[PDB]
Amino acid sequence: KDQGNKKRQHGLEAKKSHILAARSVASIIKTSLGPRGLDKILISPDGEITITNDGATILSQMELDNEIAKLLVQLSKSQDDEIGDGTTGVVVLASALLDQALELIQKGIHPIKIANGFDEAAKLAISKLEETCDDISASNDELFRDFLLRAAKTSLGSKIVSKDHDRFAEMAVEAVINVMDKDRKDVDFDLIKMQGRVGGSISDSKLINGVILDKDFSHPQMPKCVLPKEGSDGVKLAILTCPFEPPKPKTKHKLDISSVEEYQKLQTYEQDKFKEMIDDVKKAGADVVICQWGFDDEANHLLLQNDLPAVRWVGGQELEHIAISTNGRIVPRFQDLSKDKLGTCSRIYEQEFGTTKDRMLIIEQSKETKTVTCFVRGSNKMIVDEAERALHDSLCVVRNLVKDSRVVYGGGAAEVTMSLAVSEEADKQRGIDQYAFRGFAQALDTIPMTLAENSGLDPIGTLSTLKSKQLKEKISNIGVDCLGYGSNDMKELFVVDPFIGKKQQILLATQLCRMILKIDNVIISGKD
Template identity: 55%
Template sequence: MALAFDEYGRPFIILKEQERKSRLRGLDAQKANIAAGRAVARILRTSLGPKGMDKMLQSPDGDVIISTFSFFLSFSLANDGATILEQMDVDNQIAKLMVELSRSQDYEIGDGTTGVVVMAGSLLEQAEKLLERGIHPLRVAEGYEVASRIAFDHLEKISQKFEFGPDNIEPLVQTCMTTLSSKIVNRCKRALAEIAVKAVLAVADLERKDVNLDLIKVEGKVGGKLEDTELIYGIAVDKDMSHPQMPKRIEDAKIAILTCPFEPPKPKTKHKVDIDTVEKFQTLREQERKYFDDMVQKCKDVGATLVICQWGFDDEANHLLMHRNLPAVRWVGGVELELIAIATGGRIVPRFQELSPEKLGKAGIVREKSFGTTKDRMLYIEQCANSRAVTIFIRGGNKMMIEETKRSLHDALCVARNLIRNNSIVYGGGSAEISCSVAVEAAADRHPGVEQYAIRSFAEALDAIPLALAENSGLPPIDTLTAVKAQQIKENNPFCGIDCNDVGTNDMKEQNVFETLIGKQQQILLATQVVKMILKIDDVISPSEY
């Protein structure tokens, strides 16, 4: 028991002896932290690459889920490292750091969430060996920092730039196909990659090299097959016309976009209307009808041929709209209204009195499309004046497939966005990691201090990605890695990687297996930062002890 004394000589307890014994400190704490981080990495390791294995998870209510990374929902599918870590019930604080690592990669790059965790786990494994040899954790962290910079710069050297444009999208498509190769939807990877690239180019500002992914709406509906997924140069809204007798197709539509109620105004204060005769009641009804009739007439006077309203209106008003030949759509969400306004070049009208001809949006075609039964309909707004808002409409046999396709397309969209920001690529299949490993190993000789051991360990940790790819593809990992590394050195070809798909060549350039340079660099930097943070922790104190 640790005691201290106040200014009057009275003792008080700082820390109880049994609590001091229950705490892990020094090397024991570091080993425990490393074990927690490696445990998370082992979960994701077997799912890396195009031949990765599936996982079976159990949701809190006892439902069993068979998936390749799944949400904790009944019978949902996913194939993303960030997804499973996001939904795992993690108590250990170091494991939570690994979850944050994957989340950071997903937020910044959108792809590579599995690889960054596997790399961090390998760095921790190598660091544990150095700690057991008596090397101070700070020296290990410093060596890792030096090695990560060497690998970062080497990636720049082996990267290649490619030119792309509206007429030359093949490089972008090939890179997105690499991302989709490890997904459940890989059988349609070519079609989905083309959709993702065309959607990004439609909303991209190529002069500023900026892409706002919020302008790409991803919508899905159960039914049909995955091959029916389409790109709509406009907006698809999961609504239909407010009255079944309204026209289902409007050409050269002029759209009034309202966020105000399309009905007579109601006083905002409490009120009471005393009506004691039938004549007064009829007069009130006539006034309300006349007010709404004037609203409809104003819409027609400004030239509107379609009204899209955020709020609803009653059946009587709906009937009047139908008779006055003014189609309308009600209960449209605020986000969808913004996208419609962007796509059609219109202005959202918050007060009905502000409606004017210049605030109307314009679209070439507005049509209602039926799916399956006649009750399931959607509204397509196409051929818009400003096509810088598009919709990817996904079809699938069940909700699981649609949700997985949405997550897969998110990764592909992020990859295409990253390539527009920086059109440098490296080649996949573990070729970049193997080349960096060789470069870091060679650079270790130039550092005479203890950091040399950490730099060599970093080089060995980089081999974890190609080893996992080979193992998951059913190849002998050690033999395959050594053969590819020897081939890289002999031929001076940094594009040699693991032939996961058994194509017959190790040259990833010939296989068109691309990855973004900034995504690969981000993986190395993030993994190194988290490992350095974990190595500097030498005591774990739980707040429940005090």
């Protein structure tokens, strides 16, 4: 079917083309690896020009028909959810395993043996890093927080945000503690609302313990703050998934007003129907009415005299963050409204942010919730977008630091340690696996050499220097300098990477490398 404009490669030209196709795509982000990596000018299909060095943003904007390069995109979707820092590093590491696999294919090595060769070599590298890793919480409690404060500083060190970075460092520590419990040790991104707007500065960003839900308070006469109402417990809010309207059948409608006589009849008719539905709010004792649909003019008049601020046009997902922070429930209809399902919070007020005329509102708690909302501002639209993604990566590092106390020192010291460990174990394991372990260690050298290239240094001369300091002297962690520093030995400069984070990166690199080798056949049809 559709023999024209149809290409197929099996067992001959596919093995050579799959390696060169992924090599040309991975070579794009090699220069962007590390904080010193170089930016790129990206153009959206709508015509917007953006500039960022993040590998995830660059790879996500790629829409391509290359069958092998799609496997790099499918993994990148899981990289942001699992880790988020394994975007550029794994793709370069996965392509390094492919370049070493192509050299073995030319030698007559079976591709599945290469897949099993990298799998057994990855398991040996985990055991070596497990012995040489160090503990944080065992060193001190405040030194752990010092790593969290400097974890966001590393991601923000390459951006203008680095001036005020001390503000966002504390926002990442207080947010993870609330949304994550030390039992499961998991930070759900769906429980963290990321919202930002253009204008102001980066120092005006505040950390809110609950949903923001910007609203104009409907009618302007309604008050800007919600009072406890004479010793009542917290502040009760109403979550309604049904619109507030006078009851009407499904058949006719067609309401015609001939004169003022019929105008006063319909006005008092709809007002009396509003008095029946507001009683359910009064019986439940809800201070503010939050609904998914808009309100009428007479609807806000009765809510104004009763001191009941009105909130209309709230999205479905926005109502989900309300019940989680305030420990409320989703009430489907008006007859099911009860005081037990009302969200309880500390207060609701309107806080002016800088010179912005939006004048958003803040709903606080003062108690530990199951969700938080990160609020970010900046003087430029790019600064806001870069600060949201850098904060997202900072929240993921903190998740891995608490989940696993063991960590490794990055900056090239981890990859060189993995190479010297596998190369030593390569001679201990004889047979075909000997060459499979040597090729795996040579592929691990791509990351520190790429970081050496991206640092403006000789990749070959620097790689031999790190191997000389970790052997003739003693076994330790000394990496390449990505950003200009005082000297080498990252262990002295306190550059830390999560062990479970680096372990997740090396597994996804070998997982995708196998799937690339497990597919020797590519069949694509034409474009009708």
